[PDB]
Ligand SMILES: Cc1cc2nc3c(=O)[nH]c(=O)nc-3n(C[C@H](O)[C@H](O)[C@H](O)COP(=O)(O)O)c2cc1C
Ligand SMILES: Cc1ccccc1-c1ccc(-c2cc(C(=O)O)c3c(c2)nnn3C)cc1
Ligand SMILES: CCCCCCCCCCC[N+](C)(C)[O-]
Ligand SMILES: CCCCCCCCCCC[N+](C)(C)[O-]
Ligand SMILES: CCCCCCCCCC[N+](C)(C)[O-]
Ligand SMILES: CCCCCCCCCC[N+](C)(C)[O-]
Ligand SMILES: O=C(O)c1cc(=O)[nH]c(=O)[nH]1
Ligand SMILES: [Cl-]
Ligand code: NA
Ligand code: NA
């Protein structure tokens with residue numbers, strides 16, 4: 515352990531959390547990150563951490579999950595923090611405010627967060643201009659193994675979700691290495707029912723058709739992000755449609771609307787998606803199931819409650835090619851990225867794996 519990790523986890527982050535409400539802390543974090551005001555990223559990525567997936571090289575397999583940088587403002591500072599890939603969003607076609615405040619809650623005794631932001635978004639046009647302004651810099655980053663993903667949502671007033679997602683494909687698809695069809699937000703009425711078989715097949719057919727109409731050089735991979743709250747029938751159906759249509763990968767999982775037994779935080783009954791440690795093994799089991807249902811043929815990005823190298827390796831061994839985190843950053847701060855990477859490398863070596871690639875799906879073999 516480095517000095518920063520302990521100092522941030524034991525002194526800096528508790529003091530910030532005592533001074534600022536959760537959404538103010540989030541906005542300040544985005545601002546400091548966007549300006550590069552961040553502790554010295556003291557970890558050199560070993561070649562063991564490199565992963566080739568989704569038509570790209572990833573210098574390390576630890577990404578920032580959607581929701582931290584909703585409007586594409588802090589992309590370069592997130593690479594400086596040490597993430598191997600960045601996902602921005604969710605972005606909706608038109609700007610919209612999201613739910614009334616308060617809409618984010620800390621559950622520190624659970625190492626968890628509840629949020630009901632409701633897709634607060636600057637809109638596609640604003641994000642489009644932000645990404646265009648650094649598009650060549652991102653081309654170089656991607657070439658160097660630091661790809662960019664864009665997570666697409668839908669407006670609250672939209673009549674047909676498929677036209678919302680199609681517009682996101684047309685506008686931000688050419689600026690992304692991969693797109694994410696977010697059909698699993700718990701905070702937009704009726705959104706998650708897009709996960710059922712008949713609506714999903716029509717929706718994803720339209721999204722793939724639009725993606726295929728982009729010029730080859732600007733054509734992203736398309737992934738679907740699913741909830742952890744699905745029935746077995748839902749998961750079977752999603753796996754079936756993903757394979758029938760040639761979807762490029764899955765993100766597993768979004769936040770949960772459940773409230774597992776044992777939560778201690780005073781705010782556990784707030785409405786919203788729960789993230790962090792109480793989500794961890796629910797997410798890992800959903801990875802394990804979706805990997806088996808897709809025969810290991812569909813790349814998975816595993817996400818939910820990762821704060822250590824062991825947590826990351828469990829998801830990789832369950833079938834994730836890549837992992838993301840968000841909530842751990844809100845408790846440990848920026849040092850958590852280097853921490854997860856260093857512990858993952860040590861554990862790979864300890865378990866006899868030549869690299870991350872050899873551990874993907876290793877529990878199933
Ligand atoms: C405050 C907050 C906002 C989020 N907003 C989004 C979002 O806009 N789009 C999305 O697909 N996921 C969103 N998520 C979900 C995360 O991307 C991730 O799936 C989830 O939080 C589990 O990972 P974690 O336990 O490491 O935080 C949000 C999470 C949090 C905590
Ligand atoms: C300390 C620091 C230095 C340089 C750059 C960034 C940081 C930093 C500081 C705060 C956070 C943070 C905190 C919280 C919270 O609830 O307390 C969040 C968050 C981010 N996003 N959502 N929420 C609820 C993240 C990172
Ligand atoms: C009517 C639409 C007005 C613009 C959309 C609102 C943007 C919300 C900004 C919140 C940013 N953040 C995720 C960091 O809290
Ligand atoms: C306070 C940090 C604790 C980390 C581990 C907490 C255990 C969380 C268990 C999740 C609940 N579950 C869905 C599995 O029943
Ligand atoms: C988001 C609030 C952060 C407060 C503390 C941030 C410390 C800044 C890191 C130090 N330095 C600028 C040299 O990277
Ligand atoms: C082909 C090798 C696959 C895994 C080997 C290393 C695993 C070490 C721990 C195994 N375990 C005791 C947890 O079942
Ligand atoms: O904007 C939000 O409320 C939000 C979106 C999403 O996909 N997941 C989440 O937990 N929150
Ligand atoms: Cl373009
Ligand atoms: Na805000
Ligand atoms: Na089944």
Ligand code: NA
Nearest residue numbers: 715754755758
């Ligand atoms: Na099908």
